[PDB]
Amino acid sequence: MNITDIREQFPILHQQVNGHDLVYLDSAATSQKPRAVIETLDKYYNQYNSNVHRGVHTLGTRATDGYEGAREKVRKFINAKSMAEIIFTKGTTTSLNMVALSYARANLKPGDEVVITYMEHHANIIPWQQAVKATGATLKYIPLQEDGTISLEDVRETVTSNTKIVAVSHVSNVLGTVNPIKEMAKIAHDNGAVIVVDGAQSTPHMKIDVQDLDCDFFALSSHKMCGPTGVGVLYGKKALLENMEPAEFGGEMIDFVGLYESTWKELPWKFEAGTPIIAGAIGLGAAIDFLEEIGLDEISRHEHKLAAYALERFRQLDGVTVYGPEERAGLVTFNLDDVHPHDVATVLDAEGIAVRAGHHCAQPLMKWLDVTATARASFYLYNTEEEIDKLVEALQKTKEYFTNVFVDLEHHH
Amino acid sequence: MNITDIREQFPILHQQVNGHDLVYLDSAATSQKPRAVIETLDKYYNQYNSNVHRGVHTLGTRATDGYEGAREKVRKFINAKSMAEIIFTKGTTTSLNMVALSYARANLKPGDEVVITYMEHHANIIPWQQAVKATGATLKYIPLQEDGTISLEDVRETVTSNTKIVAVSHVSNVLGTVNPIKEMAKIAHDNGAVIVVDGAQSTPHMKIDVQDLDCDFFALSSHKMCGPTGVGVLYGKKALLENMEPAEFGGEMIDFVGLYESTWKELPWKFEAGTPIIAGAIGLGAAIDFLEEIGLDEISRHEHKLAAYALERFRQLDGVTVYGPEERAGLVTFNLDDVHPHDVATVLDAEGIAVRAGHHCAQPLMKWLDVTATARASFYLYNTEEEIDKLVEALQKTKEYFTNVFVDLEHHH
Numbered sequence: 048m049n050i051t052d053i054r055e056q057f058p059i060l061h062q063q064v065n066g067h068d069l070v071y072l073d074s075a076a077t078s079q080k081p082r083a084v085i086e087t088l089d090k091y092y093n094q095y096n097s098n099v100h101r102g103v104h105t106l107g108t109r110a111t112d113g114y115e116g117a118r119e120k121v122r123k124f125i126n127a128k129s130m131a132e133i134i135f136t137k138g139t140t141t142s143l144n145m146v147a148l149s150y151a152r153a154n155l156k157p158g159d160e161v162v163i164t165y166m167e168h169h170a171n172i173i174p175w176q177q178a179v180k181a182t183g184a185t186l187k188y189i190p191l192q193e194d195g196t197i198s199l200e201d202v203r204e205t206v207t208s209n210t211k212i213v214a215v216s217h218v219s220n221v222l223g224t225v226n227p228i229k230e231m232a233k234i235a236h237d238n239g240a241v242i243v244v245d246g247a248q249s250t251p252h253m254k255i256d257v258q259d260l261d262c263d264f265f266a267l268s269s270h271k272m273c274g275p276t277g278v279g280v281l282y283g284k285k286a287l288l289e290n291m292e293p294a295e296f297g298g299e300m301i302d303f304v305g306l307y308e309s310t311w312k313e314l315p316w317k318f319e320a321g322t323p324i325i326a327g328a329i330g331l332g333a334a335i336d337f338l339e340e341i342g343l344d345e346i347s348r349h350e351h352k353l354a355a356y357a358l359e360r361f362r363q364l365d366g367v368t369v370y371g372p373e374e375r376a377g378l379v380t381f382n383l384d385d386v387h388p389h390d391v392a393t394v395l396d397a398e399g400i401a402v403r404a405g406h407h408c409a410q411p412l413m414k415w416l417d418v419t420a421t422a423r424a425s426f427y428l429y430n431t432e433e434e435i436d437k438l439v440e441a442l443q444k445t446k447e448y449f450t451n452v453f454v455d456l457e458h459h460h
Numbered sequence: 461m462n463i464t465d466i467r468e469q470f471p472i473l474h475q476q477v478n479g480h481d482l483v484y485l486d487s488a489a490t491s492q493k494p495r496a497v498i499e500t501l502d503k504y505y506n507q508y509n510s511n512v513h514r515g516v517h518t519l520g521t522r523a524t525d526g527y528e529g530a531r532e533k534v535r536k537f538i539n540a541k542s543m544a545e546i547i548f549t550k551g552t553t554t555s556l557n558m559v560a561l562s563y564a565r566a567n568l569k570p571g572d573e574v575v576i577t578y579m580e581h582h583a584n585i586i587p588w589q590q591a592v593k594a595t596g597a598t599l600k601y602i603p604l605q606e607d608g609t610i611s612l613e614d615v616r617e618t619v620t621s622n623t624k625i626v627a628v629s630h631v632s633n634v635l636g637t638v639n640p641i642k643e644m645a646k647i648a649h650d651n652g653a654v655i656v657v658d659g660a661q662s663t664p665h666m667k668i669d670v671q672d673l674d675c676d677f678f679a680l681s682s683h684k685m686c687g688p689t690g691v692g693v694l695y696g697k698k699a700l701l702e703n704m705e706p707a708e709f710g711g712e713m714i715d716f717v718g719l720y721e722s723t724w725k726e727l728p729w730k731f732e733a734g735t736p737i738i739a740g741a742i743g744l745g746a747a748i749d750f751l752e753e754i755g756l757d758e759i760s761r762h763e764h765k766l767a768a769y770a771l772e773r774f775r776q777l778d779g780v781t782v783y784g785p786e787e788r789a790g791l792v793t794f795n796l797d798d799v800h801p802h803d804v805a806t807v808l809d810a811e812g813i814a815v816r817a818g819h820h821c822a823q824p825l826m827k828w829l830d831v832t833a834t835a836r837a838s839f840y841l842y843n844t845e846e847e848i849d850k851l852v853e854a855l856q857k858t859k860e861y862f863t864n865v866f867v868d869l870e871h872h873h
């Protein structure tokens with residue numbers, strides 16, 4: 048895996064911000080795209096765009112083969128058994144809402160539980176809050192250990208035979224924790240529950256095998272894995288999708304439409320109402336071809352290296368706290384002792400460095416961490432150790448800068 | 461309006477299919493894109509892609525300004541009063557389902573009516589079928605006159621003081637009828653109802669002014685108006701959106717998230733859950749800039765010319781029936797007397813000509829027309845009279861070809 052050659056493929060990395068080379072360390076907010084993906088969208092709109100399915104003309108057939116071809120690339124990429132289990136959506140958030148609408152609201156009754164965890168992103172909290180309110184069921188939280196991991200004993204304790212759904216992040220977008228999904232799916236199933244896995248932050252960065260995980264549903268976003276924005280996937284075991292009703296209705300997802308009643312198409316098209324995200328899904332297929340050619344295991348190994356290097360270099364800084372476990376995905380969320388993380392992010396952008404500040408859509412987690420906000424540097428296959436040196440040098444300079452503003456503000460007062 | 465110069469801007473038009481120049485006459489299934497739109501997506505992914513809102517770094521701010529800037533272009537384009545009334549969705553079909561979920565299901569009770577029409581597309585039928593079934597309300601249909609238009613007396617008759625929602629197409633994707641939306645909105649409102657307008661086929665082709673129409677909601681698709689796929693808009697009057705709950709839940713559309721309860725952001729972001737369709741919405745803004753520079757009124761006048769020319773030349777063909785009224789948008793749906801429309805479409809694609817065959821997602825309408833399927837040629841700003849001559853010449857050749865296959869099949873038997 049050669050990082051110079053990989054970087055050459057991402058035009059956006061080769062520019063300056065505020066007079067400094069860009070150092071983009073915000074791929075957990077979104078990833079950048081290689082020329083293979085952007086040129087795939089260009090070739091689609093330059094050469095073969097047309098609406099898909101019922102192909103009667105040559106560009107229609109080409110577009111259709113492109114769109115359904117990308118469906119097959121996705122199925123192979125996550126090791127699903129069938130294309131019928133691969134639904135294109137506009138993103139992880141929509142995929143999780145479809146499960147909460149079409150599965151949870153159809154299957155929960157008073158006394159049923161949905162169990163989630165304190166580290167979940169909002170997209171894997173609010174749909175359940177709403178679905179339990181709608182059905183009179185109960186929402187429960189699995190507690191965290193003090194390093195921000197989950198113990199399977201806590202899982203066993205929290206999940207009961209009234210639990211119908213466990214929903215849990217594969218990888219935390221804040222802590223970098225990789226959760227024990229395969230063993231949690233066993234506990235869910237032993238209790239008569241399904242497990243819903245939020246794979247938004249795992250799928251770009253590590254190999255996903257839904258047969259090995261034995262997850263009932265798995266949601267992911269293209270924009271985080273070198274693909275176009277506005278596109279996602281919901282995977283669900285075929286036997287569960289077959290018994291779920293559509294979450295929206297329209298053209299393309301019907302078989303017969305009468306004045307008052309309609310019947311639906313087979314899977315996966317039952318869940319794809321209206322003209323689909325044709326260019327975006329084909330560009331997500333090109334992203335997958337791109338990542339597979341590099342190797343997901345090579346990408347994970349590179350990120351392990353960057354994360355171990357980052358945590359070590361963060362520990363060399365005084366006055367900095369890093370949240371979450373030592374063993375982790377390719378991101379670091381942190382605070383400088385005396386500086387608001389928004390000011391940290393603002394100053395780092397003056398040195399060309401892009402990180403994020405805020406709650407990262409995990410308010411209950413920030414509460415658990417006893418903070419109101421954090422800063423986050425997150426990595427991907429185009430980032431390097433030198434970029435991490437630049438970050439840790441700028442955090443040092445940031446600390447000195449703010450301690451000097453303060454020291455000299457109180458020689459004023 | 462110079463059609464040579466406009467055609468020069470659409471790379472996809474300049475190729476051959478089956479050894480003939482392409483003649484694309486299927487823009488009602490989807491439109492082709494000018495270089496200004498494709499190069500807008502390229503510049504986004506080559507230069508300033510980043511996740512949007514809470515901008516702390518320079519590419520983030522640029523992406524955010526791009527995305528919210530396109531929101532303002534849309535508001536101005538349909539003459540909405542406020543950006544709070546412009547919601548980005550993945551397409552017309554999703555926009556209409558959001559109204560059926562968040563407005564209709566919250567506001568219908570037994571004895572309430574939703575009134576639609578026999579010419580509606582499935583996307584403006586099935587969400588209502590489902591919403592009335594969910595609430596025990598009643599669905600009614602406004603009848604059509606024999607030329608496929610709607611009479612306002614029929615509207616007055618069908619809409620009553622129990623009607624809460626009238627939902628109706630601005631322009632029919634099959635008949636080419638332009639419905640009297642402004643006068644229908646008066647009748648809805650006089651009866652205490654809201655009107656939901658499906659503008660998928662009007663917005664690309666004619667000026668839309670939501671203040672003049674006084675529609676309560678209006679839905680449209682980018683892919684039909686020179687923009688990227690996977691993107692749409694729901695407009696709704698601000699006072700109605702303010703009282704509607706979100707149709708999906710997650711990050712970005714909240715203000716506070718506790719363990720069990722959450723509060724939502726203000727409009728429009730209350731309705732935009734998760735990372736939005738950032739590239740697609742910015743490319744929809746570039747499509748709008750493109751169409752506005754040509755002039756929507758100039759585009760409508762060009763299509764009036766093409767439609768009047770087409771209907772006249774179709775009447776010169778023997779054995780061909782055209783459905784719908786003389787005064788119409790830029791499309792013609794038709795059947796050849798003795799040939800299935802799928803075979804018509806297949807043969808026309810052998811001569812480079814792209815049209816569609818099927819029910820066009822309007823099964824109740826095909827039933828009303830007493831046919832099982834139709835063929836459809838549909839026009840846009842890059843099509844010419846010469847392309848219409850090619851179509852009518854190929855339909856003539858198609859008729860002779862099939863009458864000769866038949867004549868000589870029965871000199872065999």
Ligand SMILES: Cc1ncc(COP(=O)(O)O)c([C@H]2N[C@@H](C(=O)O)CS2)c1O
Nearest residue numbers: 075076138139140168220247268734735
């Ligand atoms: C673990 C996890 N789950 C779900 C989501 C929502 O994904 P989206 O619907 O693509 O915005 C995310 C998103 N979080 C945002 C972030 O971490 O900055 C951008 S992707 C995520 O990280």
Ligand SMILES: Cc1ncc(COP(=O)(O)O)c([C@H]2N[C@@H](C(=O)O)CS2)c1O
Nearest residue numbers: 321322488489551552553581633660681
């Ligand atoms: C009048 C009318 N209303 C709603 C839709 C659905 O729009 P989409 O959600 O972009 O597929 C359509 C779609 N009909 C398809 C067609 O006519 O071929 C492609 S756009 C439409 O024409």
